[PDB]
RNA sequence: GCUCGCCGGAAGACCAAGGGUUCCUGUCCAACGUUAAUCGGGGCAGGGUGAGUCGACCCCUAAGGCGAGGCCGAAAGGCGUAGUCGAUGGGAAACAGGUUAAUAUUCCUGUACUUGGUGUUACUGCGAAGGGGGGACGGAGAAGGCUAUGUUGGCCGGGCGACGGUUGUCCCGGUUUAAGCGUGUAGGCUGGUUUUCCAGGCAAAUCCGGAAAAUCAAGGCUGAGGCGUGAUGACGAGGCACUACGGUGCUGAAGCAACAAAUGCCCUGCUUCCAGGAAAAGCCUCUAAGCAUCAGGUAACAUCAAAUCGUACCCCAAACCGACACAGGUGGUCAGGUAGAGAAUACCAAGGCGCUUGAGAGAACUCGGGUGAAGGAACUAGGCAAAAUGGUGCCGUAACUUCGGGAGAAGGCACGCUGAUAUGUAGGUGAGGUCCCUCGCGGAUGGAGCUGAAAUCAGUCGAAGAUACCAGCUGGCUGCAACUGUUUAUUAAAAACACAGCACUGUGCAAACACGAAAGUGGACGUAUACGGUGUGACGCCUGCCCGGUGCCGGAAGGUUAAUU
RNA sequence: AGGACCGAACCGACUAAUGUUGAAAAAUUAGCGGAUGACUUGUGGCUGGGGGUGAAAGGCCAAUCAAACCGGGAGAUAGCU
């Protein structure tokens, strides 16, 4: 059983773009953005508990950060992951 | 025409990579060089 | 039996082939097999050691029995196989207690005779027994030179040994190479002698089968530099110095055996 | 947007490596872009990579690395045992359709599959670090069965033609569908079963090996493809309906057959050869210590788990390696039409491009080409370069020769199209029907339909029929090297090196020899028909004299002679 | 059957021209040799500088080779410019 110590740490942010609206208007599918050590399991635990809806399936993915520049200085974003939850038909979170 | 540098990931860090250099006593002194140069990066692993 | 190729090119005018339909054609007795990788002639440090070795084809090591220590135990030659790491055939044994096994095929030694091993051994070909209990004057090959260590002297192809004398716990050997020696007389050897003699009548007739041998080619010394070989140098062909190895030992009746260990055992150099 | 041109065994498509946001959208044109740029692989901002099955990780080992102890070495360290790493190899499992501006075997729809944990119900000898089996292996060749794929007809939809003709032996397009599951075929291999006994498999074995039997004659293994199902589905020419003129939404016919056919599959086969062709695990099985009405084994249903990381884009290239948006380099996969022996070549398809300066002019001269009177090597160091020859079938072919060659020697003839033989032949393929059946994915007979060389005769057009592209110049004397090979990466490819063969010589195995303060290691898991060194260089006929010099080998009496005493 | 023949891929580099501040610090065009083998090629490994490796050209050992490269002795020494 996953602590709820780790449980309150693992979600970070909705994701909003138009892939994650429509993902939701045709999917059922929540985008989130994710701690980047924070497993499948841990994510469906999270989700289920916290937005207290129920999940089918969980998959994810790491987003590479991005090398910028600023004011002639060489810079890197950070790496982030993604999750993609899908919820089971009746949800609507 | 070929050139002399035909590059694969896995034969630079074996041959050039961190672990290579630590060990030997040699490599480790090429650490402690770079180290003692204050290089940003002591090996080809980044 | 020594077949001539037909000229049908000229890689194949000079070539001269062993050919016995006797040998196996399928596959070798798995249990017996081992790996055994090329080394190039490269030591442990990775040098070349020995020059002029390297490629050829893949080979499959045989455990050959050198010891013949079933004792009392008779045997029946099943085949007669091919094996690619020595000049001599083999042969695939089934002793009667059901275990197989490889031995050097005597000459006249066919698929369906019986061989034996011990003191009580029989006196003919195929038949391993301690010196002492063999007669004086008879050929004999896969001999022993230390009891038990298992067959050193007259391995390869057409070869065999010759007891000359018995004196007490010594025999005295006429090895192959002209060289008389003294072995102990507890040390085992096989009657008769290797088979597949027609092995040195085999003319290889092209440079690329030597290199399915592994062997490599070898370099002239004169054809050299100085700074290669003692040969080396000269404008045009020269030559004008005594004959040497690459390391500047002299080549060509220079004597280079040192042992005083095993001094005592030599009746007489082979000359 | 219409036309034109170029590539199409690539200049298309897709991976691995390597790169790392170059991907997609909006916005901007300073610099970058060999010009301008509204454009961009440029700036700026936002978006974008979804996996139980693909790969990595993982289990297993190769070469090799590292290596507890150990052995060795002034120190640093060297080697190496047990072990432990190390893929370029072995090991579980997913396909079709749809969808985004940008991901998809990952999302969705449909249909599947694998392995492990649990909980059970039921029969139960389970159990390894050990045994055995298996995995498990070369080259070449030969043909049979196939499929991918194509072509033609049938089918269905549309057409009736800008200029003479075109209701027809007319035109255009489509005619697609997977993994899985069921069947176990063409074919390949193997004699099955049950007892008895045993010096073998480090001990045990009921397993493997061996000996004897009795009996049974087909039991087992493997296997492309077809067929059925998957699929009343999906896809589908088009038609329609909106268009933010980018494409969406809806609707949807036929969806068969015959022939041709691979380098792909059966095939890790079969045949044959000598140069004799990885390992280890998963897997099958055997018992041991232990466990012993338990745990555990096995089959079934159910139930949970299958994490993590990679996934965008480029990838024969403007994104990799070449300082460049550089005519260079870069492993693997896919492989349509017509002609063709072909992956050559020409023109095309799908698909992609016109190579990031243009506009004129129409001097010399330079580069890359085309043609040339008469002559035809007079050129020149030299026929350098160019010109020429060039296909298939048949006729014909010298010296010499090691009997294979030389030889495609040389030299010649035929070649298009149309008709007949024959409305399409020899051949290939094979339906219906038929019969028999150890009852089928069967056999035998039968030939409809399909496909289809080449030959001869006749006729016919042109200057020319291997019409383009493509595609040997030939012969004579002679040096040298036997030959195929190899070499000065970047001015030398040869007569140089190598070579098979030959000889001398060393070497008795803890071999000579080599690498190494050494331990060791190669030589070699070889043993004088073997291995090292040296010279010579196929083959043929041969290889004469000299031991004074220098070297090597043997001798061992005498002279000379070290440390030591 | 074959280090067999002809010939693409693939590997090589005989001749010529071009190029020579190149498109390119070794290439392009047209020809040319091998093309089942002593063949070619991917990935990984091993041999290290008086050392390696060399079908031997003093070849090659990262555009460097009759002794690599980097750092050090080092401001070597220079009756020479
Ligand atoms: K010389
Ligand atoms: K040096
Ligand atoms: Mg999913
Ligand atoms: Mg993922
Ligand atoms: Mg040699
Ligand atoms: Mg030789
Ligand atoms: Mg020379
Ligand atoms: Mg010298
Ligand atoms: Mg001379
Ligand atoms: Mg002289
Ligand atoms: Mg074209
Ligand atoms: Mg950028
Ligand atoms: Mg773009
Ligand atoms: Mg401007
Ligand atoms: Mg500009
Ligand atoms: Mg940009
Ligand atoms: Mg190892
Ligand atoms: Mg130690
Ligand atoms: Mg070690
Ligand atoms: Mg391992
Ligand atoms: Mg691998
Ligand atoms: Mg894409
Ligand atoms: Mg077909
Ligand atoms: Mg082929
Ligand atoms: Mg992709
Ligand atoms: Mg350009
Ligand atoms: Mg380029
Ligand atoms: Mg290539
Ligand atoms: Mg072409
Ligand atoms: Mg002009
Ligand atoms: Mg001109
Ligand atoms: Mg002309
Ligand atoms: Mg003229
Ligand atoms: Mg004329
Ligand atoms: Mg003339
Ligand atoms: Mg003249
Ligand atoms: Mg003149
Ligand atoms: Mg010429
Ligand atoms: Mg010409
Ligand atoms: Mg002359
Ligand atoms: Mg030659
Ligand atoms: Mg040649
Ligand atoms: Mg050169
Ligand atoms: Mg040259
Ligand atoms: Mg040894
Ligand atoms: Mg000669
Ligand atoms: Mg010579
Ligand atoms: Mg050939
Ligand atoms: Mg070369
Ligand atoms: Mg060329
Ligand atoms: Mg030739
Ligand atoms: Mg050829
Ligand atoms: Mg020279
Ligand atoms: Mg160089
Ligand atoms: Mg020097
Ligand atoms: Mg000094
Ligand atoms: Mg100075």
């Not at chain 3, 055994?36 to 990775?46: A, E």
């Not at chain 3, 007669?135 to 298992?150: A, I, L, Q």
């Amino acid at each position: 059983m996953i602590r709820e110590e780790r449980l309150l740490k693992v979600l970070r942010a909705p994701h909003v773009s138009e892939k994650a609206s429509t993902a939701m208007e045709k999917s059922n599918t929540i985008v989130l953005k994710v701690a980047k050590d924070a497993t499948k399991a841990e994510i469906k635990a999270a989700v289920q508990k916290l937005f207290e809806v129920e999940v089918e399936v969980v998959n994810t993915l790491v987003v590479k950060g991005k090398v910028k520049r600023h004011g002639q200085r060489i810079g890197r974003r950070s790496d982030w992951k993604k999750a993609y939850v899908t919820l089971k038909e009746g949800q609507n979170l | 025409m070929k050139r002399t540098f035909q590059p694969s990931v896995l034969k630079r860090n074996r041959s050039h990579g961190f672990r290579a250099r630590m060990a030997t006593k040699n490599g480790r002194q090429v650490l402690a060089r770079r180290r003692a140069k204050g290089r940003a990066r002591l090996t080809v692993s980044k | 039996a020594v077949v001539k190729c037909k000229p049908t090119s000229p890689g194949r005018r000079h070539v001269v082939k062993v050919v016995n339909p006797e040998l196996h054609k399928g596959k070798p007795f798995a249990p017996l097999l081992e790996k055994n990788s090329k080394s190039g002639g490269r030591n442990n440090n990775g040098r070349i050691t020995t020059r002029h070795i390297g490629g050829g084809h893949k080979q499959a090591y045989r455990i050959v029995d050198f010891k013949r220590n079933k004792d009392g135990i008779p045997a029946v030659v099943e085949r007669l196989e091919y094996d690619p790491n020595r000049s001599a055939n083999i042969a695939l044994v089934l002793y009667k207690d059901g275990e197989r096994r490889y031995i050097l095929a005597p000459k006249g030694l066919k698929a369906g005779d019986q061989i034996q091993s011990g003191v009580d051994a029989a006196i003919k070909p195929g038949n391993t027994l301690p010196m002492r209990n063999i007669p004086v004057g008879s050929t004999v090959h896969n001999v022993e030179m230390k009891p038990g260590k298992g067959g050193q002297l007259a391995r390869s192809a057409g070869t065999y040994v010759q007891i000359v004398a018995r004196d007490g716990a010594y025999v005295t050997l006429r090895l192959r190479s002209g060289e008389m020696r003294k072995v102990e007389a507890d040390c085992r050897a096989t009657l008769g002698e290797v088979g597949n003699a027609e092995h040195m009548l085999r003319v290889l007739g092209k440079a690329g089968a030597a290199r399915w041998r592994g062997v490599r080619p070898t370099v002239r010394g004169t054809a050299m530099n100085p700074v290669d070989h003692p040969h080396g140098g000269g404008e045009g062909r020269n030559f004008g110095k005594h004959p040497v190895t690459p390391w500047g030992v002299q080549t060509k009746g220079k004597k280079t055996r040192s042992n005083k260990r095993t001094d005592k055992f030599i009746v007489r150099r082979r000359s």
